[PDB]
């Protein structure tokens, strides 16, 4: 149909376009590379072609698909690995003998090879149905049906034909819909453009616990179900590490991992590691992976795949939420997504803003976060779901004022830090309290108090300790440890202990084991207890030396507690933590008189 007028860089101009929508997907040239229409100048439409071009001729054919860059939502997304332009990566390996994308491959959006078992819904013939309703379900996992087959949004009618229970393939018809005669047939998959968010019934308040399973978050600033999060940091920050832990431990029923332009070895590691390791609520065959789907993309792999990653992933997440699942979406990193834009603004010749990144940055990040939150699912059964977004970014040389980090921080309500100095001693991730806040902290403590722990009371003293520690440390540096008071010495020690035992997730035998809110609470009871009794003791006359040497064993025990597997009496209160409480009491008394 159209004919290539020019290729200047990855940017292609082709005449004989009478139309085309925004960001319309095309297959360009005989090669059949990915593209999207960004703009139209005259009859000539400028289309960026984002798969590497080293050999596209002028006057090669241009085929419009007729709809924007879109995603399929349907059966077999779980335990199936995809790119950001929704090509199954497994399908490519077999055919192509190119494990990664080579230049010029056209592989359909889903797997049309794997038959799936369809069972019929509470909607039988003659019944009205509307988008996001559970028309049926597909068995995908050993424990649960993952993919609840939804009628798509922006479709409606009464069902003339319901296919019976049995096996069918993806392209075969299984549903016929009545509304102005045959409105159309439906297939197992449905399509949606990824620049349109999916519509919900209502959004609902975020105040319900999100257990990410990592001690350091639970202790300092927990997230919420419905959360939005920013995390900075630059290599040796433990972001890959916290993703793997996050996937294993996560209470959410789906986790969607987004690789924005990753090392490739990093993607190779996490893929291998989900079936090698076991889940905490049990998992039969590829345990963790059963709950994990990967969108993975490397650093030179298509600029479209990388740009679309956050939208392909957020659309997936919204679909699981409309299904009635709790989703934890990890994107890593939005900063690598931001580089895809920096590149897009130069090529096109549009004028950018500061740091050579465009101004449209701020809108695009904001749109992604607002589609997240906790909501009541669209569809007649009605369920509760969430999309809680944890989004990684990277500072430009210790500069946190770079447009990407500042923008994400603008939109977020939770900020979790990352300190370079503390990572060097091996404490990554490294969250303090002067580089981090959470608005959810206040409601979240109220909900944890209820469940069992004393957390809110301990949280306040814990915050104070860290806040004083920093200030007191500046005096040690400059003046020396000769200007201190004895209570201030106490604040320094307890603090050093907190730094190691929560923030560090680095091994010494084994990478640290699942620590819940309950575990995390016990650690806090022992550190806070140490501090109170010791200050009383010094106030009331007593040696510093006597008190520190005496705590001794108790300190070794809390350090290593996290390596030991949870439950050692109970999850709730361990016998190992219970006993220390007595030891402090016995010491306090010896010291006083």
């Amino acid at each position: 149909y159209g004919a290539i007028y020019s290729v200047s860089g990855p940017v292609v101009i082709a005449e004989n376009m009478i139309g085309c929508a925004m960001y319309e997907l095309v297959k360009v040239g005989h090669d059949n590379l990915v593209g999207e229409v960004i703009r139209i100048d005259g009859d000539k439409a400028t289309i960026q072609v984002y798969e590497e071009t080293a050999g596209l001729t002028v006057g090669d054919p241009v085929l419009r698909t007729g709809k924007p860059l879109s995603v399929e939502l349907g059966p077999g997304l779980m335990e199936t690995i995809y790119d950001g332009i929704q090509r199954p990566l497994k399908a490519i390996k077999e055919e192509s003998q190119s494990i990664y994308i080579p230049r010029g491959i056209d592989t359909p959006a889903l797997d049309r090879t794997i038959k799936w078992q369809f069972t019929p819904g509470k909607f039988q013939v003659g019944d009205h149905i509307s988008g996001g309703d559970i028309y049926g379900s597909v068995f995908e996992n050993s424990l649960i049906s993952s993919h609840k087959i939804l009628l798509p949004p922006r479709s409606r009618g009464t069902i003339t034909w319901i296919a019976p229970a049995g096996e069918y393939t993806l392209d075969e018809k299984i549903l016929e819909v009545e509304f102005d005669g045959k409105k159309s047939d439906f297939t197992l998959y449905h399509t949606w453009p990824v620049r349109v968010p999916r519509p919900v019934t209502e959004k609902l308040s975020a105040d319900y616990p999100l257990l990410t399973g990592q001690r350091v978050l639970d202790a300092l600033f927990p997230c919420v179900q419905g959360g939005t999060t920013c995390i900075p940091g630059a290599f040796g920050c433990g972001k890959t590490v916290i993703s793997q832990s996050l996937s294993k431990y996560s209470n959410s029923d789906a986790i969607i991992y987004v690789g924005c332009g990753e090392r490739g070895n990093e993607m190779a590691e996490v893929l291998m590691e989900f079936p090698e390791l076991y889940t905490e609520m049990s998992g039969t065959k590829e345990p963790i992976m059963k709950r994990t789907t990967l969108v993975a993309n490397t650093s030179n792999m298509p600029v479209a795949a990388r740009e679309a990653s956050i939208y392909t992933g957020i659309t997936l997440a919204e679909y699981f939420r409309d299904q009635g699942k709790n989703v934890s979406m990890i994107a890593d990193s939005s900063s690598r997504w931001a580089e895809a834009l920096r590149e897009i603004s130069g090529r096109l010749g549009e004028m950018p803003a500061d740091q050579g990144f465009p101004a449209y940055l701020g809108a695009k990040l904001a749109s992604f976060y607002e589609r997240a939150g906790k909501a009541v699912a669209l569809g007649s059964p009605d369920r509760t779901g969430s999309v809680s977004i944890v989004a990684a970014v990277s500072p430009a040389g210790g500069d946190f004022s770079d447009p990407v980090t500042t923008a994400t921080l603008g939109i977020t309500q939770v900020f979790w830090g990352l300190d370079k100095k503390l990572a060097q001693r091996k404490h990554f991730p490294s969250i303090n309290t002067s580089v981090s806040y959470s608005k959810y902290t206040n409601v979240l403590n109220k909900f944890y108090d209820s469940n069992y722990p004393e957390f809110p009371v301990l949280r306040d003293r814990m915050k104070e300790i860290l806040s004083n520690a920093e200030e007191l440390e500046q005096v040690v540096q400059l003046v020396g440890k000769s200007a201190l008071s004895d209570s201030d010495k106490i604040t320094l020690d307890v603090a050093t202990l907190i730094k190691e035992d929560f923030l560090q997730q680095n091994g010494y035998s084994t990478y640290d084991a699942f620590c819940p809110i309950w575990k995390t609470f016990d650690m806090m009871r022992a550190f806070i207890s140490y501090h109170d009794e010791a200050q009383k003791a010094v106030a009331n006359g007593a040696n510093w030396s006597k008190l520190a040497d005496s705590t001794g064993d108790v300190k070794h025990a809390v350090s290593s507690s996290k390596f030991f597997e949870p439950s050692r009496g109970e999850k709730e209160v361990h016998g190992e933590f219970e006993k220390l409480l007595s030891t402090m009491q016995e010491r306090f008394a010896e010291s006083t008189d």
Binding site: G398, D399, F400, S401
Partner: protein, 45 residues
């Protein structure tokens, strides 16, 4: 971390402060060490 606009005004006066202060602290140390040598000898006597 820090402002990207007009940190130069506060920082410039600090920097000067520091090198100027350092020079001056050295003179106060030099005087203190100056007297110290003298009294050590006088005290033994």
């Amino acid at each position: 971390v820090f402002p990207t606009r007009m940190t130069l005004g506060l920082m410039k006066t600090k920097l000067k402060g520091a090198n100027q202060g350092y020079s001056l602290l050295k003179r106060k140390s030099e005087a203190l060490t100056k007297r110290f040598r003298d009294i050590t000898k006088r005290i033994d006597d």
